[PDB]
Symmetry: C2
């Protein structure tokens, strides 16, 4: 009673002692349901022995654990509110969530936490059945409680837990009473284990996972391990099932291991308890092993996820069933040989993506629906693997990955990024136990899931001897799954697969003592033989993911480059409400946190509500399982599938002349795994009309898969066919334009058409049709764009990074350059009026750009603008070379002939196809929450907007928001639509990068460094 | 106050929780003295900052920890006695010590200990200086406290410790007060960590090691690591010294690492704090590394232990010294290449011996004098290595080994022999932290000692993944020292050196799943490349250590067989007092323990009082560093030294004819390391007198070494030179014997001489000279001996082992065979009287042995006895074939010409030399505490005892105790001298074994299995 009081518990600061990480906590095991019937376990029916405690709980908040009154042990306080479980109290409003990347959210002082420790007091009052108390053992399972937590049952102290992403089990057989039962959980936000929880997420705390109650008999199945051994041709399989019990040893106890495929029983085995002799003292008397022979097993893979149901029944000699535990087993073997990772004897090509557990509305509380939607999006966007992102995930996630066929790289909850140096805790043996608790238990939890193929020690923890010891422990316990570790440059002895972060394809970044070579050179280093799979690459932070084509070309060309994991899947945004209560996404810094990072949480390929980014189309196109090669008139189709045959795919081809279709057809696909097929196209019609012939092929799945709908497109490709150049001549313009030369203006009139050039500025001041003005602002040049997330880097107002693109642009005066008029002349021709303008942009007496324009008004109404731009070599390369204007008329449709229909950039245009796309103006603006340059469409041959038509080769972006507004504003909900419509037509555009979000990632081939540029535009009224 | 009470502490059973192994305990480090002066640290002067708390303490004993009153926290109880510290309370009489080998001393139930937990309450009241409280940190160091212990300072709880053989340090800066300070230590005999302390010793408990108090400044030298890197010729050395501090970081702090050889400074280095960049966050700001260049360093080895003094001085920029820490560094490099362990580029030949920390009087409390005496005995008996025997030893032991030059194999305190199976705790990750605490700290304690060359994970713990993880951790932290592990058969991945236990030279013992092949076949197994060094071999249990010559021949012949460790050095006997108080040695079972083993603790090469066994001479002879080969007249001397030159050795040769010297000389030895020398002997005198010429060479050290006296002999050898057979004839016997044939007797009279044969028994009933009887019992046959410790094995009264030699002997009726007379005839010759006797030994109607004897009385007085013995093939081989008698006269001198002067056996006669030895009768009996057969001398050509002289080739043993008394009695102090003197002359003797003490270890070449034997004896009066 006295020892169960708060004073005794809080005197021993278990949240500040690295030696003490658990108290009265049961050992980890694969998930159990305690089925009392074999048929219920085989069909995965819900078990009445498994009770869910999720629901309405009583919550109280305190600024310090010592501020909690002791009367909370006896009864709930009247001021306590009613919340839901699982839920995080930071989302409710009790505490402000804090986001951080490198620095710790608390003062670094291991193993001491600050005194102001936020404390959550959870209470639940329920009723238990009397049959649960007469016999058996009743335990409580917390699937996850953030940081440390103390448990009380009926006013008596039960145990203490420290891990956040691993289940904690406590025995309540001697604590539960018959009738009313009230528990009391005291959760602390910061503990000593939070020094190992420095992951890239929002730091929330509380019971964010399910709380369950399990009842077992007096004799239990404490653990069971399953493994599969194959031969060279994978025709005979040996399933080894080792079962460990706990409790009294009796001679009549038997274990039956049954394997089922659907409803058909495949193999079975019944043996009495007692194992083989291992040591001089004998063998285990409480473990029994079973060897089941399977003839021609259906192998498991991400393409075909064949699953078997394994039921372990502990019963008596007479056949009376005591307990039954079921699991899903997939027959597969991952092994590294000759420096190659082989699954079922075939080289894997990982198309994975980093995935953070982030609910759109509930924060870190993950449910089945969001998980299923994420899996469907991954599989539809050509992803076959998923990384757990530096912590263990929901146990249901692995089951769903087994069901849908996704490779899983399970990660431990170890991260010491804030420590200086990074191995400060990972080399100290005093922290060796705690890290092991965050590893070994996880190894014991998900070793029976065929989706899990690679174990991970951690990330951004440096390299310590503890990491080597844990790597050796995992390799000794589970040799079936190769493991990896990023820390130490990923060339250390703690890894079997070279897994660097953001290693570029060709350019090297030789950091001191931790260099990041190119992957091609990394494979060619002396003494290196392990395969290379990128744990983190292609940082997609907002408008990003450039150079993905180079990455996948390097992956496909090199046999030992087996792909990588895109970082990351889902944006980490928190919803917030304004003074109307309108919902809007928010990033770090919007919750009143002083030690926070900016929008660096807002990386991913989808939004918070699983809305796909334009980069997801690029990711889908670059990860296609079908490669196409057009030779002459035939098409070579090469499948990248390793285990499945092309039985649910057909090829659909279409030939188009400048967006107008001419011929089409459907050819079924019959391709062997990693095979070749030849498709002979029929006679392709080639008209004499001017234009370019484009051939587009797509792969359509006719039937509905478990993860895709009917008519889903999995791959596509486009080629340029024969071109017929336009050699016809325009008709002679009977009407001639009339030019009036004012003192300050040049006005050209052609019937309805009218133009007015301002002689003081040298730009096209106004356009007129009838009596309606068409320009709110003059058509000027634009050598700057809104800075992207990759351009800013890690540069803030208080910290200036000289290597960032935006800092070099503003340092050279690109955003502050004022145009100075040099020449502005006008003269009439025989059938046209020529306007010659020449300007120069200067900053502090230094000329940066010189623009010379020639305007030609034809008698047919066309405006021919030829622009020549000279850029200084010493100045930083401009991000844009082209024009800028604000039209005075808004339109509801935009019809452009060019590459689309998605947002594409010079380094991200492979996914876009050349066609005629008619889209609403609302879809022209990509709703990035952090405002930046967006909506650009490259390869545009024609652009129709309202009464205006632009022709030529250019990159256009059209939106309701100016570039200066996108520069000034920091949130998308604060953006307001301006009058008219802003249009930016650029002759040349500069890349976006995407290798990393802290260094210049744009390759030299996509930089505007030629020096002299020229582009021609034709503006007419349609 | 309330939390400091006993109720709060004992509510949390920290001795029953594997997760909690330490509370408020400082990190491990190399030993510190906190010198405030550089000259004091260089000369290793005692430091006044280091206080010793050893002395008189107040002790109380309680049967349970819950029985301790709380008033013990405030003041000592009046009923508490005054004991010494360090000391074990089992020796005082509070508790009975228990010895056990395999089974646990408690009921096996991890991690629960029995409720009846013996508890010792220690208290010390002292005074501290005020200057220690104004500044700096004061800590208390327990060098060793057995099992768990709780600490209180001035009534306030300080910490909790669990390890027994490793130091535990607690901070007392906030607990100590000015003036009187009283501490309170509560020590528990059994804890959860005792499951890892199942070593082969007496289970004592209490504070058995030193208690010390250390004072450090506010800025400390927390740790320092030293390492040496060499080139291929070991001419240039790089000493790397890494220093870690604790406390405030200041810019003026400097570290000076100075190296001294005697008084001469060799190298120095001063650098500011700050290390190299290691990770992306930078490097350590509190560690500084120093690289010192040494030109032509004096390498350290067991032959020449060259030592340097390394002084690390933390001071300021102006030169004000803050702290100084000194250590001993030896320049050496142990590395395994090509499957060979090389020290300084030379293949080591380990001559080690297992050594248990066992004081002759104080139990486990070890002091400097006993350690120095043990080291001197080891070095004088040709031992160059010593194993820590399954636990860390005194920190002074490693320093003394560095000073005297002994290789040390440091072992961790891990042993789970009683667990079924043996890896039950070593594969469970829940016990992974605790084992790491018993490893990593030890790695941090003795990594700066050049004597330590091999780390050890443990012994008899099976094989678990925790062992692999710990092996990888040690290999990552300290790659300079190769490690080994016995568990799992010593072919597992957790070892680098194959170290089996009691692996025989040629015969295999294929145990299931843990086979013990022969070492020669073990080296030749497929896929095996690691060298083989026996961790335990040649079990010397009492009369043992047979076949050592075969072991060392195998070691010398095979390059990859690099020797082994004899088991063990010192007997584990406890002194006890009888009702006179006379001291006598006692083994397990004499302290009222029901779960105990018998004298299996009483193994070793020396007694409790360091009295050498006769097997120590064999160990010394078989481990000589000089090998001799006699060819013709010259002698080849080959040195086995690897680094030293023969500068303190001279060869002394002597030629003897039947024990009478003829020529001698001294030749100095000038032999290179592993070199060859040729000694040409002068003209050896060969007289025509009958006899055998023996050449004996010895190696004598003239000067006094630090471990040997002047005139010490290190090696010796003997050879048989040319033999002159006796062809002369005995003189004609003028007097003839007179024979009287009685009905029941045959009486032969020859002047003074008289003999009487009993016709009913057929044996020599009596001998007479004058009127004095010479035989108390008739001279009969003896086919049995007292069973040795190797013959009994693990067989007791309640457990019968059918493979034990003694059980086969008593099952066949060897000890119960009754002699049946077959023939007894007498007849006079021309000058002699012939007596022909023939007997037969039977048991249950089955004849075992048949003896036929011929007695001849010559007129000169000689008795010629020719004995022929026939032994059945199916019966077990007898241990002895020869005669037995009890003379009626005791004598004070025994003069025998034969092999001696030590106790030698047919498999242990290599150390004995053939000469004439005159020794007292008291030295004829080896004082083995467990009575067995002893005192046998083989190769005896003549034996003079009183008026009797025996001639021939025989093995004799003479003592005051009969063989039946040695069989019946179980202690040496209960033995009583019988009337007369018992003499056993045997024509043939059977081996003793010694490979192990639980299986028949005698080779087939030393077994009496010929079937027919013959021997001749000549008995006369001199």
């Amino acid at each position: 009673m006295i020892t169960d009081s708060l004073a005794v518990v809080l005197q021993r600061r278990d949240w500040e002692n690295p030696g003490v990480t658990q108290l009265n906590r049961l050992a980890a095991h694969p998930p159990f349901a305690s089925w009392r019937n074999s048929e219920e376990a085989r069909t995965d029916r819900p078990s009445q022995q498994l009770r869910s405690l999720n629901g309405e709980w009583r919550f109280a908040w305190f600024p310090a654990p010592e501020a909690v009154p002791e009367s909370w042990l006896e009864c709930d306080l009247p001021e306590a509110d009613t919340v839901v479980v699982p839920s995080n109290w930071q989302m409710h409003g009790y505490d402000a969530p804090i986001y951080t990347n490198v620095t710790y959210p608390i003062t670094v002082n291991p193993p001491f936490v600050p005194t102001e420790n936020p404390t959550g007091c959870y209470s639940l009052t329920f009723n238990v059945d009397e049959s649960w108390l007469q016999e058996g053992q009743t335990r409580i399972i917390f699937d996850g409680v953030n940081s440390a937590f103390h448990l009380w049952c009926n006013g008596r102290w039960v145990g203490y837990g420290q891990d956040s992403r691993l289940p904690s089990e406590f025995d309540l057989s001697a604590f539960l009473r018959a009738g009313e039962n009230r528990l009391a959980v005291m959760v602390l936000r910061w503990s000593d284990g939070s020094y190992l929880e420095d992951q890239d997420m929002w730091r929330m705390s509380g019971i964010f996972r399910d709380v369950s109650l399990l009842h077992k008999p007096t004799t239990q199945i404490s653990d069971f391990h399953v493994a599969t051994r194959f031969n060279d041709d994978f025709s005979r399989a040996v399933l080894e099932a080792e079962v460990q019990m706990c409790g009294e040893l009796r001679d009549y106890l038997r274990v039956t291991v049954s394997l089922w495929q659907g409803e058909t029983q495949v193999a079975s085995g019944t043996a009495p308890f007692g194992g083989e002799i291992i040591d001089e003292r004998g063998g285990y008397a409480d473990r029994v092993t079973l060897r089941l022979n399977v003839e021609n097993p259906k192998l498991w893979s991400a393409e075909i996820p064949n699953l078997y149901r394994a039921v372990v029944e502990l019963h008596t000699a007479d056949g009376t069933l005591i307990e039954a535990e079921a699991c899903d087993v997939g027959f597969r073997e991952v092994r590294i040989e000759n420096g190659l990772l082989l699954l079922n004897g075939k080289p894997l090509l990982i198309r994975g993506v980093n995935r953070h557990e982030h609910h759109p509305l509930h924060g870190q509380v993950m449910d089945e629906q969001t998980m299923v939607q994420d899996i469907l999006l991954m599989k539809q966007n050509n992803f076959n693997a998923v990384r757990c992102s530096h912590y263990p995930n929901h146990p249901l996630w692995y089951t769903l990955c087994d069901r849908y066929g996704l490779y899983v790289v399970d990660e431990a909850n170890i991260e010491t990024h804030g420590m200086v140096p990074m191995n400060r805790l990972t080399d100290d043996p005093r922290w060796l136990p705690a890290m092991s608790e965050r590893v070994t238990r996880m190894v014991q939890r998900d070793r029976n899931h065929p989706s899990v193929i690679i174990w991970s020690l951690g990330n951004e923890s440096g390299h310590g001897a503890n990491h080597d010891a844990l790597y050796r422990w995992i390799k000794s316990v589970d040799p079936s799954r190769p493991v990896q570790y990023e820390g130490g440059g990923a060339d250390t002895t703690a890894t079997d697969i070279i897994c660097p972060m953001y290693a570029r394809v060709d350019e090297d970044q030789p950091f001191p003592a931790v260099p990041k070579w190119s992957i091609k050179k990394w494979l060619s280093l002396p003494g290196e033989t392990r395969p290379l799979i990128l744990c983190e690459y292609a940082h997609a932070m907002g408008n990003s993911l450039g150079g993905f084509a180079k990455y996948w070309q390097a992956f496909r060309q090199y046999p030992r480059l087996q792909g990588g994991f895109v970082w990351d899947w889902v944006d980490q945004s928190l919803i917030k409400y304004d003074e109307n209560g309108n919902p809007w996404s928010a990033y770090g810094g919007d919750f009143g946190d002083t030690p926070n990072d900016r929008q660096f949480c807002m990386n991913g390929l989808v939004f918070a509500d699983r809305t796909p980014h334009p980069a997801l189309t690029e990711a889908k196109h670059q990860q296609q399982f079908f490669q196409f090669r057009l030779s002459g008139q035939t098409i070579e189709v090469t499948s990248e599938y390793l285990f499945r045959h092309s039985d649910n795919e057909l090829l659909h081809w279409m030939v188009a002349l400048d967006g107008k279709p001419l011929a089409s057809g459907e050819v079924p696909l019959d391709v062997a795994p990693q095979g070749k097929q030849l498709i002979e196209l029929p006679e392709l019609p080639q008209p004499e009309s001017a234009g370019q012939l484009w051939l587009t092929v797509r792969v359509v799945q006719p039937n509905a898969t478990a993860w895709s709908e009917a008519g889903h497109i999995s791959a596509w490709q486009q080629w340029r066919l024969a071109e017929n150049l336009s050699v016809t001549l325009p008709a002679a313009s009977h009407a001639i334009p009339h030019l009036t030369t004012s003192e300050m203006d040049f006005c050209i009139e052609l019937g309805n058409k009218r133009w007015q050039f301002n002689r003081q500025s040298g730009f096209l001041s106004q356009m007129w049709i009838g009596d309606k003005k068409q320009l709110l602002t003059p058509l000027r040049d634009q050598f700057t764009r809104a800075p992207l997330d990759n351009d800013i880097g890690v540069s803030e107002a208080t910290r200036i990074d000289p290597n960032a693109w935006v800092e070099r642009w503003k340092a050279a005066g690109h955003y502050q350059a004022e145009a100075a008029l040099l020449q502005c002349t006008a003269d009439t021709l025989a059938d046209a009026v020529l306007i010659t303008t020449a300007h120069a942009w200067q900053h502090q007496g230094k000329t940066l750009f010189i623009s010379r324009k020639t305007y030609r008004i034809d008698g047919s109404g066309q405006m021919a603008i030829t622009v020549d731009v000279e850029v200084a070599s010493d100045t930083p390369h401009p991000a844009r070379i082209g024009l800028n204007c604000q039209l005075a008329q808004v339109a509801e449709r935009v019809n452009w002939l060019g590459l689309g229909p998605q947002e594409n950039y010079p380094d991200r245009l492979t996914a876009a196809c050349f066609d005629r796309w008619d889209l609403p103006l609302s879809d022209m603006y990509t709703p990035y929450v952090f405002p930046s340059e967006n909506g650009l469409r490259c390869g545009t041959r024609e652009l129709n907007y309202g009464p205006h038509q632009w022709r030529g080769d250019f990159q256009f972006n059209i939106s309701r928001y100016s570039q200066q507004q996108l520069m000034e504003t920091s949130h998308r909900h604060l953006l307001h639509a301006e009058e008219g419509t802003w249009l930016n037509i650029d002759g040349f555009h500069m890349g976006i990068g995407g290798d990393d979000s802290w260094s210049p990632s744009v390759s030299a081939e996509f930089q505007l460094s030629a020096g002299r540029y020229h582009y021609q535009l034709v503006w007419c009224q349609k």
